Enzyme design. Structure first.
Site, PDB file in Angstrom:
ATOM      1  CG  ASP A   1      -6.886   2.403  -3.403  1.00 25.76           C
ATOM      2  OD1 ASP A   1      -7.614   2.733  -2.450  1.00 25.76           O
ATOM      3  OD2 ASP A   1      -6.708   1.211  -3.726  1.00 25.76           O
TER       4      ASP A   1
ATOM      5  N   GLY B   1     -24.167   3.363  -2.320  1.00 27.57           N
ATOM      6  CA  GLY B   1     -23.017   4.039  -2.882  1.00 27.57           C
ATOM      7  C   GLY B   1     -22.949   3.837  -4.379  1.00 27.57           C
TER       8      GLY B   1
ATOM      9  CE  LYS C   1      -4.338   0.981  -0.320  1.00 32.45           C
ATOM     10  NZ  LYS C   1      -5.070   0.489  -1.510  1.00 32.45           N
TER      11      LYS C   1
ATOM     12  CE1 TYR D   1     -24.141   2.293 -14.496  1.00 31.16           C
ATOM     13  CE2 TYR D   1     -21.761   2.247 -14.718  1.00 31.16           C
ATOM     14  CZ  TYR D   1     -23.018   2.200 -15.286  1.00 31.16           C
ATOM     15  OH  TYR D   1     -23.150   2.065 -16.649  1.00 31.16           O
TER      16      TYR D   1
HETATM   17  N1  LIG Z   1      -7.793  -4.460  -4.217  1.00 30.01           N
HETATM   18  C1  LIG Z   1      -7.046  -3.254  -4.547  1.00 30.01           C
HETATM   19  C2  LIG Z   1      -7.003  -3.048  -6.063  1.00 30.01           C
HETATM   20  C3  LIG Z   1      -5.718  -2.409  -6.565  1.00 30.01           C
HETATM   21  C4  LIG Z   1      -4.655  -3.433  -6.909  1.00 30.01           C
HETATM   22  O1  LIG Z   1      -4.695  -3.983  -8.030  1.00 30.01           O
HETATM   23  O2  LIG Z   1      -3.776  -3.686  -6.058  1.00 30.01           O
HETATM   24  C5  LIG Z   1      -7.649  -2.028  -3.870  1.00 30.01           C
HETATM   25  O3  LIG Z   1      -8.607  -1.471  -4.406  1.00 30.01           O
HETATM   26  O4  LIG Z   1      -7.157  -1.641  -2.809  1.00 30.01           O
END
Ligand SMILES: N[C@@H](CCC(=O)O)C(=O)O
Ligand SMILES: NC(=O)c1ccc[n+]([C@@H]2O[C@H](COP(=O)([O-])OP(=O)(O)OC[C@H]3O[C@@H](n4cnc5c(N)ncnc54)[C@H](OP(=O)(O)O)[C@@H]3O)[C@@H](O)[C@H]2O)c1
Length: 416
Positions: A142, A216, A102, A222
Site C-alpha cells: 500500500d 492524479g 489492514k 497513469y
Molecule cells: N485493494 C487493496 C490492494 C491490496 C491487496 O491485495 O489487498 C488496496 O489497495 O488497499
C-alpha cells in the site's frame, strides 16, 4: 471527522436498503481483532527506536483476511480500522474467499534508509507473526510500501515458520523472482478499465473517441489513462497531479507525459497542452472522469459542476455522501470505489492462489480471469441498483454485506 466513524455511518446508511438483523449489523460495526504492537529497529546511528504498528482483521467469515500495509507518518488505528472495513466489502463484492484486513506503521519511510526499511519490515513481521499467515491474514503493498518490502517480509515470515508450509502465500505483491504474479503492477487500472467498459455497455454509449480526464498521475492514474487510450480507444484530453494539471483538446500520449514527469517537476507545463488546476479538470467536459488522486475531491461545492457521464472511483473515497445523491440526481453513473479498484485485490488473490498451489499462470490467464470477475461484479452491482432504484454505492454495499452476512449465518456466528 473520524475515518472509522465515517465508514460505520456509511455502512449504517447502506443497511437501510437490505434486510439484515440488528445483531449482525452490530457484529459488522466493529472489527473482530485489532493488534497494536511495538516495532523496534536498530537505526544507522546505532540507537534503538520503537515504532507503533497496527494490524486489523475486520471479518474473516468468508475466508482469511486480506489487506495492505501502510507506512505513513499520519497513520492512526482509526484509519486502519476504516480501511479494513472497506477491504471486507471490497473482497465481498467481487466474490473472493477472503475477509477484510489492514495494517500500518506510524513512520516516515523517506527519513529511513534502505537497511532501516528492511529492519522495520522484518521487525513488523516478527511482531505480528502470531496473527498472520497464508490461511489467516495475507498482507499486501500500500502507500509507501512496495514489492521490495513484500520480499523482505515474506523472507522473515519464512525464516520464522521454518519452511513448514507455503510461505510465499503469506504476502502478495512481491517480486516475480519469489512467488510474484504477472499483471500485479497494472491490476487496479485494468480492473477500472473493465468496469468502465461494462458501464459504457450498460449506458449505450460507444467509448471509442470519447474524452476522458484522470486526476492524479500516479501508478493508478497513469495506467488508467494508458489502458483507456489503448484497449478502450478513449482520448485522454486532461490529466492532473499534486502541483497542477494539463489539458489538450486533441488529447495527450500517456508515455510522453510519464516521460516528462521524470525530467521535470510533476506534470506542470506540458509543451502542447494548457496548464490547468485540479477543480478545472473535475468540472471539465469529458465522457469518463477518473479521480485516482487523494480522497474527497468531488464535494458539495463542485458536485453540481460535474459534467461527466461516468465517474470512475479509482481512488478510495473520492466522492462525498451528499455528492453521491447530487450526482445521481444529475443522472451520472457512479462506479463505487471498492468495486472500481477491486482489480488490485483480485490479482493479489490470483497471486495467493498461485503461491498456495505451487503452479503459476501466464499473463493471458490472469487477464481473462480478472476480466470475468470484474464483469460479474459490475453486473451484479448494476442489476441490484436497477432492480431496487438505489444509488450504485448502496447496491454495492447490499451485494457485499449480503455475502458477508450469509457467511456469518452459515458459520452460526449470528442466528437471525
Ligand atoms: N485493494 C487493496 C490492494 C491490496 C491487496 O491485495 O489487498 C488496496 O489497495 O488497499
Ligand atoms: O493511488 P496511487 O497508488 O496511484 O498513488 P501514488 O502512486 O502515490 O500517486 C497518487 C497520485 O495522486 C497525486 N496527488 C497527491 N496528492 C494530491 C493532491 N493533494 N491533489 C491531487 N493529486 C494529488 C500524486 O501526485 P504526486 O505524485 O505529485 O504526489 C499522484 O499523481
Amino acid at each position: 471527522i473520524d475515518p472509522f466513524e465515517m465508514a460505520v455511518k456509511q455502512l449504517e446508511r447502506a443497511a437501510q436498503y437490505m434486510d439484515i438483523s440488528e445483531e449482525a449489523l452490530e457484529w459488522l460495526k466493529k472489527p473482530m481483532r485489532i493488534v497494536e504492537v511495538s516495532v523496534p529497529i536498530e537505526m544507522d546511528d546505532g540507537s534503538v527506536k520503537v515504532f507503533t504498528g497496527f494490524r486489523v482483521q475486520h471479518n474473516w467469515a468468508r475466508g482469511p483476511t486480506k489487506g495492505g500495509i501502510r507506512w505513513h507518518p499520519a497513520e492512526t488505528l482509526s484509519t486502519v480500522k476504516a480501511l479494513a472495513t472497506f477491504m471486507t466489502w471490497k473482497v465481498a463484492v467481487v466474490d473472493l474467499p477472503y475477509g477484510g484486513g489492514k495494517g500500518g506503521i506510524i513512520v516516515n519511510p523517506k527519513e529511513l534508509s534502505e537497511r532501516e526499511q528492511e529492519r522495520l519490515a522484518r521487525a513488523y513481521i516478527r511482531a505480528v507473526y502470531d496473527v498472520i499467515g497464508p490461511w489467516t491474514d495475507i498482507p499486501a503493498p500500500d502507500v509507501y510500501t512496495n514489492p521490495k518490502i513484500m520480499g523482505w517480509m515474506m523472507d522473515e515470515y519464512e525464516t520464522i515458520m521454518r519452511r513448514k508450509g507455503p510461505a510465499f502465500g503469506v504476502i502478495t505483491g512481491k517480486p516475480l523472482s519469489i512467488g510474484g504474479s504477472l499483471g500485479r503492477g497494472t491490476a487496479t487500472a485494468q480492473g477500472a478499465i473493465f468496469t468502465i467498459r461494462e458501464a459504457a455497455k450498460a449506458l449505450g454509449i460507444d467509448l471509442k473517441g470519447k474524452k476522458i480526464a484522470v486526476q492524479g498521475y500516479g501508478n493508478a492514474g497513469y495506467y488508467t489513462a494508458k489502458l483507456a487510450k489503448e484497449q478502450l480507444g478513449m482520448t485522454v484530453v486532461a490529466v492532473s497531479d499534486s502541483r497542477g494539471g494539463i489539458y489538450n483538446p486533441d488529447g495527450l500520449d500517456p508515455d510522453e507525459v510519464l516521460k516528462w514527469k521524470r525530467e521535470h517537476g510533476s506534470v506542470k507545463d506540458f509543451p502542447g497542452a494548457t496548464n490547468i488546476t485540479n477543480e478545472e479538470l473535475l468540472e471539465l467536459e469529458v465522457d469518463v472522469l477518473a479521480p485516482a488522486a487523494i480522497e474527497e475531491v468531488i464535494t458539495e461545492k463542485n458536485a453540481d459542476n460535474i459534467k461527466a457521464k461516468i465517474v470512475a472511483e479509482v481512488a478510495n473515497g473520492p466522492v462525498t455522501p451528499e455528492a453521491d445523491d447530487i450526482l445521481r440526481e444529475k443522472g451520472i453513473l457512479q462506479i463505487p470505489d471498492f468495486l472500481c479498484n477491486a482489480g488490485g485485490v483480485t490479482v493479489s488473490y490470483f497471486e495467493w492462489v498461485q503461491n498456495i498451489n505451487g503452479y503459476y499462470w501466464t499473463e493471458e490467464e490472469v487477464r481473462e480471469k480478472l476480466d470475468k470477475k470484474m464483469t460479474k461484479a459490475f453486473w451484479e452491482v448494476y442489476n441490484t441498483h436497477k432492480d431496487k432504484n438505489i444509488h450504485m454505492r448502496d447496491a454495492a454495499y447490499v451485494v457485499a454485506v449480503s455475502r458477508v452476512y450469509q457467511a456469518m449465518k452459515d458459520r452460526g456466528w449470528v442466528k437471525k
